[PDB]
């Protein structure tokens, strides 16, 4: 039998099949305790556990797709949805530390010490696993991979204890505390093996193809408009038809979708209470836009998200600009004009989406409280479903010697580390590209930079990243 | 606090019944595990274990001194070493030791002293 | 740990070293700081992360941190060097330790 | 083959079958003796033998529930007995400490070294599990479990050498000196298993279910009664007939049950000799409570039992209270009124339990002398039976080097430790709960606290338990 | 209790069925005793129109 590392993805005309290998590290804990939080807020504060355990999050998109292999996805197909994904966790090395005293450190290797496993088939512990946090993956396969401690947040009740206004989250009856070790463990041993082999469910597509025509602007640009437009006002109207010019006051049989609170340059747009309890809804909805490049410059939006970096790295909607979206995009009203800035949802409305780039999120997870509406497509990039892939979760083990009868020998916990290979296996159902009859050479396909610093490619750690994300709307429709 | 008072005969060379006693203020002796120890030390030599007493009765003994003395309690913390026709006179001291949990091995050690009495002999 | 145990002072002439000791349980596994107060003065950050020094701070204070104790070696001390050093840790809210006067 | 780290009890409208896994750690002996004793009393001494064995007690019901577990399983079920038990002894990993002279400790892994089992189906060795001692399981499956080392007491010849009045038990003909060493041996070396697969007794169940009526009150509260009741005495009765108000003089057909020194606020009560020997049997009979709460406060008895803490950690027998039973209960006579405080068997009488908890034991033992009465449960909890699961000891070994021909190199036990996983199974026959034409809401189970501080939870080592024991009476039967 | 029974044990509820049977109809009628002022014997011509 042969043990390998696989990586590479493999096209066709129907899905591709992308796999990554990564090393990962599941490093110590020199306490296996909960240790609950102390947060003690004082302005509704958090209350949190902090489990011993190290889940892993592979979510992203750039490490399924090497910038080759993304760019050979957008210049030939026209949609993406996944369908299934595997994760193997590969050979095993867990091992021992035994603290030379006068070295510091000599790492031999164990064959007793193993490596508790669990994954969350069943949904039985809090999913945190697409939100958008600085700890996914290495971006280059060359480095170590260390994965997450494991800790959720709960709801407990509200106290006010301390002397001027000190707010603390003490437990309540719907508290919970998750023990995860009343499971089942794979204890995965050195040179085990273990898979996890998820199945997606069937998601709507991402489109990743822009459009050659404004919405609003679909008809025949000669012959005018069967239909009327008022001149007078005031209980007599005097309707007047149109000629082939009237195209500002041209009729749409659909509307745009909805603008709420979409401005140009905190907190944001936010809900809550008086002025001060205030929670953020950062990156609006997914029907806005945050950045776009107008007549001279770039517009940046308020409810904007960086992506790293500052001066920032966002994804160039040009998309939704064409498609009577945008930053400053006021909506006007007749009424006895009133500039509003929101946009209602207009029974009839198409807002295309925010686009997805190549370091966007795959799920997230939609809540299980119910009446969800549209909850198809996450912000922050990715899908969202209801049981998404489910949580890996990896604790080594407490090998707890050595005693001596009643001493306290030694260190009781004594040192361990384990080392790895994940194998992360996902394929995309592919969709064929959008038909044109179109003579002129579509744009090429090649990552936003500005001079002299080209994208993903070593320098004299080395490997940069461009200024703008790469987006995924380069072909066009033709709508 | 605990503090532990003890009480001293004085001198008697042939062969009587040394009698000693330690009443222990702070916290009365039938109130939980605890031992109380007769220790003795010799003027320049070191310390000397006689034996100490549980509050139900049960006593152990130094296998040296076994048949000479005798630990009793009426919450009174008595010694009763006979046969002193060995001068030994040193020097009396009581103290307690928490009871330990396995009896392999002493997890205590003896934090309560009393102040000493000087028998002679 | 919870508790940072360090010693009372040390004496030292120009010339040599001063290695002091900041005792405490599992600090190996931890981080430790060290401060440097002058009289009448607030205190500097003299070590940080057990082994790096800051740009204000020169290259002759190095420390360790190994097993249960971390260590601060000051190479060839000048006439200035005469501070109560502390060394800091962080066992969930923050330790500070006693203080070796030098 | 997977190995697995098995937890979690399954429910189904017959028995639940609940497992728990620990890590378990047998230490070390620097002596392989036996060590007799010398208590050498002085007012009946003891005498025993200090084996060099571990056994292990899993005996208390609060580590096959969680406490969602326990709570599901009162206030859906009605009854609950064991049926069969495995104890499953996995991965071995005997170690030894090769002392590093300069660090002190340094533990490699021993492929030689074994773990000697043996497992006393026979039941000839004595038998010192179900009595009720701080050493019994982790209550958390995150903590490492330390077995105890096993010893027993004999039975003598009570001497009288000494000076004042020394007594000592020494060795009689009756005596006995078992050494564990002329058994079988399950040599059990790193990665062995071993299993046990005991067999319950057909027991009685323990009625998960109080009652909402009294029984001295089962009658029509209208109606009176067709029998009469004294009058005027002295040879001449005149007896006169009943209405319904005479509740105080109703005739009842079942008497209650015996109340042996029920008493509020040493030995309790207690056999013995003249007043000093007075061995105690501390929790009364098993038909008695020791703890309920009247108009005002908790009564709380001479004869209870802490379970922790102090301040105590009582069950609250409520349902002892409500049937003629409790603590200030006399019983009175009208012989020529006479108050006693005990009440006899009388019988025709009924009494029902003194109601299990979530920290009862389950099982102790009925000693091997004849005629008995009742014994089918017993106190401290549980139920007690004839053949209990037998005990488990866990040895090590002494490998005994090195030697270099005469000499005694080495410390000739050199040192070795074993840590192992003990996955301990147990299934209980639950009963389905008794019918109810009843149109109330029953009361809720959770778990008694009384402020801020919650039941079974990590606060800021962290989880504690609450202040009364969870008792399993609290839905009514209706009787 | 059976509502009781309902949310401790079970996580969603939604109705599949649904019967309606109207029992053992008994239409009857009054004679107004003139005196007493009602007297209500039994009818078996009456009806009851169910639609």
């Known amino acids: 039998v042969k043990s390998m590392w696989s990586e590479g993805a493999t096209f066709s005309a129907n899905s591709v099949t992308c796999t990554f290998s990564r090393q990962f590290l599941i490093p110590y804990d020199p306490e296996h305790h909960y240790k609950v939080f102390s947060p003690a807020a004082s302005s509704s504060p958090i209350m949190g556990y902090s489990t011993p355990w190290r889940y892993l999050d592979f979510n992203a998109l750039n490490l399924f797709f090497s910038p080759l292999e993304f760019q050979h996805l957008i210049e030939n197909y026209g949609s993406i949805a996944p369908d299934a994904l595997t994760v193997t966790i590969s050979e095993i090395a867990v091992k021992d530390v035994t603290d030379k005293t006068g070295g510091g450190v000599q790492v031999t290797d164990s064959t007793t010490g193993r490596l508790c496993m669990l994954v969350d088939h069943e949904y039985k512990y809090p999913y945190v696993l697409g939100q958008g946090q600085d700890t996914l993956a290495p971006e280059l396969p060359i480095w170590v991979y260390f994965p997450p401690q494991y800790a959720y947040l709960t709801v407990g009740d509200v106290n006010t204890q301390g002397i001027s206004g000190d707010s603390k989250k003490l437990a309540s009856e719907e508290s919970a505390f998750y023990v995860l070790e009343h499971s089942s463990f794979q204890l995965l041993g050195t040179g085990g093996t273990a898979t996890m082999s998820y199945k997606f469910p069937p998601v709507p597509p991402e489109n990743l193809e822009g459009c050659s025509q404004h919405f609003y602007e679909m008809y025949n640009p000669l012959y005018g408009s069967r239909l009327g437009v008022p001149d007078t006002l005031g209980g007599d109207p005097k309707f007047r038809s149109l000629t082939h010019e009237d195209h500002a006051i041209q009729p749409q049989n659909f509307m745009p979708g909805p603008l709420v609170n979409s401005v140009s340059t905190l907190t944001g747009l936010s809900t809550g209470t008086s002025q001060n309890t205030r929670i953020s809804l950062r990156p609006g909805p997914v029907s806005q836009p945050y950045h776009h490049w107008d007549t001279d410059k770039y517009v940046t939006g308020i409810n904007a998200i960086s992506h790293g970096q500052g001066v920032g790295r966002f994804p160039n909607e040009k998309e939704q600009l064409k498609q009577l979206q945008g930053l400053n995009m006021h909506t006007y009203f007749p009424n006895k004009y009133t500039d509003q800035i929101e946009r209602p949802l207009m029974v009839g409305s198409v807002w295309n989406r925010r686009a997805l780039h190549y370091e966007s999120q795959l799920w997230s997870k939609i809540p299980n409280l119910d009446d969800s509406f549209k909850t198809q497509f996450a912000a922050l990039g990715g899908w969202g479903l209801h049981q998404p892939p489910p949580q890996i979760f990896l604790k080594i083990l407490p090998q707890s010697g050595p005693i001596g009868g009643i001493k306290s020998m030694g260190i009781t916990t004594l040192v361990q580390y384990a080392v790895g290979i994940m194998t992360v296996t996902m394929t995309f159902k592919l969709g064929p590209r959008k038909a044109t009859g179109r003579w002129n050479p579509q744009p090429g396909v090649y990552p936003p930079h500005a001079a002299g610093h080209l994208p993903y490619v070593l320098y004299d750690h080395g490997y940069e990243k461009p200024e703008e994300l790469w987006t995924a709307k380069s072909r066009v429709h033709p709508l | 606090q605990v503090q532990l008072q003890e009480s001293g005969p004085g001198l008697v060379r042939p062969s009587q019944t040394l009698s000693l006693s330690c009443t222990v203020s702070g916290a009365s002796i039938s109130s939980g595990g605890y031992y109380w120890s007769w220790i003795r030390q010799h003027p320049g030599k070191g310390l000397e274990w006689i034996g100490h007493i549980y509050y139900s009765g049960t006593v152990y003994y130094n296998p040296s001194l076994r048949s000479r003395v005798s630990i009793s309690i009426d919450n009174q913390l008595s010694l009763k070493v006979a046969s002193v026709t060995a001068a030994d006179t040193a020097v009396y001291y009581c103290?307690?030791?928490?009871?330990?949990?396995?009896?392999?091995?002493?997890?205590?050690?003896?934090?309560?002293w009393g102040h000493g009495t000087l028998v002679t002999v | 740990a919870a508790a940072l145990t360090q010693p009372l002072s040390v004496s030292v002439s120009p010339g040599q070293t001063a290695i002091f000791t900041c005792s405490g349980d599992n600090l190996g596994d931890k981080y430790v700081y060290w401060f440097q107060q002058r009289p009448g003065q607030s205190p500097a950050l003299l070590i940080y992360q057990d082994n790096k020094r800051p740009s204000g701070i020169p290259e002759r204070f190095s420390g360790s941190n190994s097993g249960n104790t971390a260590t601060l070696t000051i190479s060839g001390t000048q006439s200035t060097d005469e501070a109560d050093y502390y060394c800091q840790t962080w066992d969930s809210t923050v330790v500070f330790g006693g203080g070796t006067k030098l | 083959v997977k190995s697995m780290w098995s937890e979690g009890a399954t429910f189904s409208a017959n028995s639940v079958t609940c497992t728990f896994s620990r890590q378990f750690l047998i230490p070390y002996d620097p002596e392989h003796h036996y060590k007799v004793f010398s208590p050498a009393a002085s007012s009946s001494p003891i005498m025993g033998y200090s084996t060099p064995w571990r056994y292990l007690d899993f005996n208390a019901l609060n580590l096959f529930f969680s406490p969602l577990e326990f709570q599901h399983l009162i206030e859906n079920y009605g009854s609950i007995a064991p049926d069969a038990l495995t104890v499953t002894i996995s991965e071995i990993a005997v170690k030894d400490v090769t002392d590093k002279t300069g660090g002190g400790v340094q533990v490699t892994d021993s492929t030689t070294g074994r773990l000697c089992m043996l497992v006393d189906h026979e039941y000839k060795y004595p038998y010192v599990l179900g009595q009720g001692q701080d050493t019994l399981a982790p209550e958390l499956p995150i903590w490492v479990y330390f077995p105890p080392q096993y010893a027993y007491l004999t039975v003598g010849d009570v001497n009288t050498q000494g000076i004042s009045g020394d007594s000592k038990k020494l060795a009689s003909e009756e005596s006995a000196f078992y050494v564990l060493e002329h058994s079988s041996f399950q040599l059990l070396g790193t990665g062995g298993t071993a299993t046990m697969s005991y067999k319950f007794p057909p027991v009685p169940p323990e009625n998960l279910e109080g009652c909402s009526q009294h029984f001295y009150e089962m009658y029509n509260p209208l109606y009176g009664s067709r029998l009469g009741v004294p009058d005027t005495l002295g040879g001449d009765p005149k007896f006169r007939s009943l209405t319904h108000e005479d509740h105080a003089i109703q005739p009842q057909n079942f008497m209650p049950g015996p109340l042996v020194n029920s008493v509020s606020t040493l030995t309790g009560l207690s056999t013995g000799t003249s007043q000093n020997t007075r061995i105690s049997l501390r929790p009364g009979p098993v038909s008695q409570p020791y703890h309920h709460w009247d108009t005002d406060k908790y009564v709380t008895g001479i004869n209870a039992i802490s379970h922790g803490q102090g301040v105590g950690r009582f069950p609250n027998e409520k349902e002892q209270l409500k049937q003629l039973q409790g603590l200030n209960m006399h019983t009175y006579f009208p012989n020529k009124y006479t108050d006693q405080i005990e009440r006899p068997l009388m019988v025709g009488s009924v009494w029902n339990r003194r109601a299990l908890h979530y920290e009862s034991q389950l099982w102790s033992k009925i000693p091997n002398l004849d005629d008995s009465f009742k014994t089918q449960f017993a106190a401290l909890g549980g139920w007690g039976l004839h053949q209990p699961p037998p005990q488990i000891f866990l040895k090590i070994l002494p490998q005994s080097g090195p030697i270099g021909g005469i000499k005694s190199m080495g410390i000739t036990t050199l040192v070795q430790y074993a840590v192992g996983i003990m996955t301990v199974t147990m299934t209980f026959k639950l009963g389905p709960r008794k019918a109810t034409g009843r149109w109330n809401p029953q009361p809720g189970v959770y778990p008694p606290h009384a402020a801020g501080h919650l039941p079974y939870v990590l606060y800021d080592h962290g989880y504690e338990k609450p202040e009364e024991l969870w008792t399993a009476k609290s839905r009514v039967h209706p009787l | 209790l059976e509502f009781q029974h309902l949310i401790e044990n079970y996580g969603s509820i939604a109705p599949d069925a649904l019967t309606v049977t109207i029992s053992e109809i008994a239409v009857k009628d009054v004679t107004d005793k003139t005196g007493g002022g009602v007297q209500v014997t039994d009818s078996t011509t009456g009806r009851l129109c169910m639609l």
């Open positions: 103290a307690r030791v928490r009871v330990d949990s396995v009896r392999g091995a002493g997890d205590n050690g003896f934090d309560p």
